[PDB]
Amino acid sequence: TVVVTTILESPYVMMKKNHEMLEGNERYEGYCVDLAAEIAKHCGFKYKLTIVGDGKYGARDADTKIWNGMVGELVYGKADIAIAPLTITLVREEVIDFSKPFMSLGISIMIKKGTPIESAEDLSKQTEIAYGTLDSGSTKEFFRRSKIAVFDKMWTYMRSAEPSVFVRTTAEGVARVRKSKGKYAYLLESTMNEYIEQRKPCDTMKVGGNLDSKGYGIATPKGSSLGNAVNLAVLKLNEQGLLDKLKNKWWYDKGEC
Amino acid sequence: KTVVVTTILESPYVMMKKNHEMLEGNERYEGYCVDLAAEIAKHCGFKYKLTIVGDGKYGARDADTKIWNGMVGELVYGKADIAIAPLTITLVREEVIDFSKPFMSLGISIMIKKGTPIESAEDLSKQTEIAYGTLDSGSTKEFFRRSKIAVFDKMWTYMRSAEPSVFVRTTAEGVARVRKSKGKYAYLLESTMNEYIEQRKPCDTMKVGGNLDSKGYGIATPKGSSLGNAVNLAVLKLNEQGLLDKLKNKWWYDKGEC
Numbered sequence A: 001t002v003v004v005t006t007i008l009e010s011p012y013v014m015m016k017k018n019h020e021m022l023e024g025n026e027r028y029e030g031y032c033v034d035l036a037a038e039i040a041k042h043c044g045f046k047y048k049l050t051i052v053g054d055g056k057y058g059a060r061d062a063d064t065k066i067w068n069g070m071v072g073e074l075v076y077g078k079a080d081i082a083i084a085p086l087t088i089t090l091v092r093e094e095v096i097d098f099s100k101p102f103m104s105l106g107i108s109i110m111i112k113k114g115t116p117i118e119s120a121e122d123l124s125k126q127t128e129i130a131y132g133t134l135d136s137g138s139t140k141e142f143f144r145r146s147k148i149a150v151f152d153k154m155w156t157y158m159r160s161a162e163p164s165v166f167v168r169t170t171a172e173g174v175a176r177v178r179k180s181k182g183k184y185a186y187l188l189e190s191t192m193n194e195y196i197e198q199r200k201p202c203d204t205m206k207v208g209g210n211l212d213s214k215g216y217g218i219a220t221p222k223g224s225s226l227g228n229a230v231n232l233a234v235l236k237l238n239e240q241g242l243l244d245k246l247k248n249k250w251w252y253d254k255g256e257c
Numbered sequence B: 001k002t003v004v005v006t007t008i009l010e011s012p013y014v015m016m017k018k019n020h021e022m023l024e025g026n027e028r029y030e031g032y033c034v035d036l037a038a039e040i041a042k043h044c045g046f047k048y049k050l051t052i053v054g055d056g057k058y059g060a061r062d063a064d065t066k067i068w069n070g071m072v073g074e075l076v077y078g079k080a081d082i083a084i085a086p087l088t089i090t091l092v093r094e095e096v097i098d099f100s101k102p103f104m105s106l107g108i109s110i111m112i113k114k115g116t117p118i119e120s121a122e123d124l125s126k127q128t129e130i131a132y133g134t135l136d137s138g139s140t141k142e143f144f145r146r147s148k149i150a151v152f153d154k155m156w157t158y159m160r161s162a163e164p165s166v167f168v169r170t171t172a173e174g175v176a177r178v179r180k181s182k183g184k185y186a187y188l189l190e191s192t193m194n195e196y197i198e199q200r201k202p203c204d205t206m207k208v209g210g211n212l213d214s215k216g217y218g219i220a221t222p223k224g225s226s227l228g229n230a231v232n233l234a235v236l237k238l239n240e241q242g243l244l245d246k247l248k249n250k251w252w253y254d255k256g257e258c
Ligand SMILES: CC(C)S(=O)(=O)NC[C@H](C)c1ccc(-c2ccc(C#N)cc2)cc1
Pocket: A100, A101, A102, A103, A104, A105, A213, A214, A215, A216, A234, A235, A238, B089, B090, B102, B103, B104, B105, B106, B214, B215, B216, B217, B239, B244
């Protein structure tokens, strides 16, 4: 039985309304739940969905060099595969393997409706509206590493701002937008932003273009014998239009705005 | 040793320089893929030679003969070391060659002559006055050939039987066909090529509708090659540093003529 690490992050993996009367894999639903079932069916394996213990995507401690999150679960042998909205990144591909991407995304801006911001450049030129990102993920690293002037400027602000502009979970960022009266903007992946914009209470918006262009991949420990098959499965699912079918199902068929 | 790169004359990816006959070797060519090859070779630490695929094709396996043609075949049969081109990542190809993570996103799209009364694939499928087709030997043809989606299956049943042939040998031929056909030919081609031509004179075509699928171009190497790991890491670094976005803008939008 293959141990799958994943993360609670809507609409990728959510607890079912009736989860308390369900067991095992049946507790959960979402895009990644459906994708896991399809990958396991094409690859011929049984599997156990497990939520990452620390609730993180994965970053490396600069001092100890120890990885956390789903990345660490793979690196240290705690899970066999990560099926999640896990961004393919150079630093991570150095320590784990990724399938070809199953979904495209870019960094984007979430505002409370009516907030006078149209772009990253607008954020970087003003100070009334605070802005930040998730911890231990690929968007914080994007700002930490960018040499593009606007983005460097934003990072200098964010890394020193008080109180802290960073959040532990996507849900914490979204809530901070919603409650901040237009004075907090949240930087997060377009996929999450576009799902949130179609949910009640319908008070947030994506603005501006995306800041980058990248993909999520299925991750395995380096050199795993599962990596080949998983990759071919992703290519097959994409070619059959199954990935587009799931995207519709969990985004746009699930729209309430 | 010097790495032999296979590529294809396809604008704006690889083009002959106006003055190519006065230049030699790699200097004869320009375009997005030319720029990208230089950067992959620098980051991976190799010398290279650009060569244009002899048959002018992307790559497909003959159904009876089982021989791969195009760039894919040059890799499969040992004629080239790497392909740096707008080569779509597909399952059938991944079974015989290796691909990096994609360097560019694309989907199949519709090119019309401006004013043509079509907005969508469904529109094309429900009418007969306007013919439509694809490049005769690439991933777009295969997408229709294999599709189980009703609109697309309907389109393939039309295309495969239409006379005269709605298929073309090169992108350029399809684009010329749209331009000459007074709105009676639509061309099914990748969004990247469509969006490039939309910004070129005579400014008489446009992309219409959403894309039909969502995929990527990858750098390809023969299966199990030693260069594959390094090339993938290069692609990742270049995407993270914004080089690939810069190149896109350089060859599509910075010198757009429309
Ligand atoms: C054949 C498909 C399985 S795929 O490899 O093209 N992936 C599909 C998916 C929708 C996707 C995600 C991400 C990107 C993408 C990533 C990075 C870059 C760059 N540079 C360009 C495109 C392209 C496609």
